[PDB]
Amino acid sequence: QCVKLNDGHFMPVLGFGTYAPPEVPRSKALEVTKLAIEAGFRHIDSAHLYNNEEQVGLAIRSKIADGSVKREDIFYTSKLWSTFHRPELVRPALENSLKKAQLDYVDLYLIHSPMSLKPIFDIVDLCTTWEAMEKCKDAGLAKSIGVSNFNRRQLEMILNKPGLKYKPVCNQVECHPYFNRSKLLDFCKSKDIVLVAYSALGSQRDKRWVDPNSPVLLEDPVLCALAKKHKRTPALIALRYQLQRGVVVLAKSYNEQRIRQNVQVFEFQLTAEDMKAIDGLDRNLHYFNSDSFASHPNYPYSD
Ligand SMILES: NC(=O)c1ccc[n+]([C@@H]2O[C@H](COP(=O)([O-])OP(=O)(O)OC[C@H]3O[C@@H](n4cnc5c(N)ncnc54)[C@H](OP(=O)(O)O)[C@@H]3O)[C@@H](O)[C@H]2O)c1
Numbered sequence: 001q002c003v004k005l006n007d008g009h010f011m012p013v014l015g016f017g018t019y020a021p022p023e024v025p026r027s028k029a030l031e032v033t034k035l036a037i038e039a040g041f042r043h044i045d046s047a048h049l050y051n052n053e054e055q056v057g058l059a060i061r062s063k064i065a066d067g068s069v070k071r072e073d074i075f076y077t078s079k080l081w082s083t084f085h086r087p088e089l090v091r092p093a094l095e096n097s098l099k100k101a102q103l104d105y106v107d108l109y110l111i112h113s114p115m116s117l118k119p120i121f122d123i124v125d126l127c128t129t130w131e132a133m134e135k136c137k138d139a140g141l142a143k144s145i146g147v148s149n150f151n152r153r154q155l156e157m158i159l160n161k162p163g164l165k166y167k168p169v170c171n172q173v174e175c176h177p178y179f180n181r182s183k184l185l186d187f188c189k190s191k192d193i194v195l196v197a198y199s200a201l202g203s204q205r206d207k208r209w210v211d212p213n214s215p216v217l218l219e220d221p222v223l224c225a226l227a228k229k230h231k232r233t234p235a236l237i238a239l240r241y242q243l244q245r246g247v248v249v250l251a252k253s254y255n256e257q258r259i260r261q262n263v264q265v266f267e268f269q270l271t272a273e274d275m276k277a278i279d280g281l282d283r284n285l286h287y288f289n290s291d292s293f294a295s296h297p298n299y300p301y302s303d
Pocket residue numbers: 016017018019020045046112148149172173197198199200201202203204218233235236250251252253254255258259261262
């Protein structure tokens with residue numbers, strides 16, 4: 001099903017994550033996005049950074065052309081990369097993503113991160129970036145607009161902006177049982193802003209940003225025990241946990257079996273005791289933990 005966003009548009013609560021590192025041929029994103037839509041995904045998360053918008057857009061267009069879905073049935077997200085925060089660059093970056101995907105509009109456009117980069121760090125007033133985002137929704141380039149990787153204080157900066165026209169509909173952030181974002185999630189709920197979780201399956205553990213020593217979420221003993229109790233899988237437990245918290249959850253998979261397994265999240269439910277057990281795993285662990293983020297003046301986890 002879908003959640004109703006604070007601008008009246010609807011967002012499907014399970015989304016397909018499309019990122020794969022450069023060693024995976026670009027052609028795979030086309031193939032797996034098609035398999036995701038076939039499996040029943042209707043929300044597809046991409047970004048300029050991911051270098052796959054051509055393939056992902058072609059996958060969406062391919063499934064429209066063969067009669068499987070209509071454009072209105074698909075919720076596509078792209079994101080404004082941090083070198084394009086200066087307000088005059090926002091609409092051209094979005095138009096560029098739309099040209100790559102060959103789509104007339106995105107369902108959702110996010111500021112990918114609060115950490116501005118030289119168009120080397122940059123200093124930009126993100127309220128002016130936001131005004132530029134509001135103009136893209138007014139022009140019909142984006143049905144909805146939101147943010148990503150914002151903390152509470154950064155989110156309040158927007159919410160408190162003089163003459164705000166549109167609240168962010170969502171804040172897409174790292175969120176899983178080792179870093180469950182409870183207090184942020186409560187704040188977002190108090191504002192009717194949806195929290196969308198990425199790395200909900202514990203991340204792709206990419207050596208560029210993730211310490212290989214970090215705990216492997218899907219081997220967690222509590223998640224494994226819950227998967228045995230429910231005769232599901234640790235991944236399904238981890239996705240279902242998000243849905244029952246009122247969090248919209250992404251799941252990346254480039255594997256045909258796991259793509260189809262992931263939509264099973266709608267087929268069972270966790271009890272209050274199960275949810276408390278998963279809540280007990282929280283350990284302030286963000287898998288993305290790299291000098292290249294942590295030294296930035298607007299790093300969100302500076303807390
Ligand atoms: N906003 C941001 O800054 C940001 C940052 C990170 C990610 N994201 C978005 O969120 C998406 C998902 O996050 P993520 O890329 O960190 O990955 P994820 O959803 O945490 O998945 C991690 C790994 O889980 C594996 N997996 C998937 N389904 C499984 C299953 N049923 N059983 C066992 N393993 C399973 C996948 O491997 P296989 O491919 O081998 O199945 C995947 O590499 C990204 O693709 C991107 O769209 C956004």
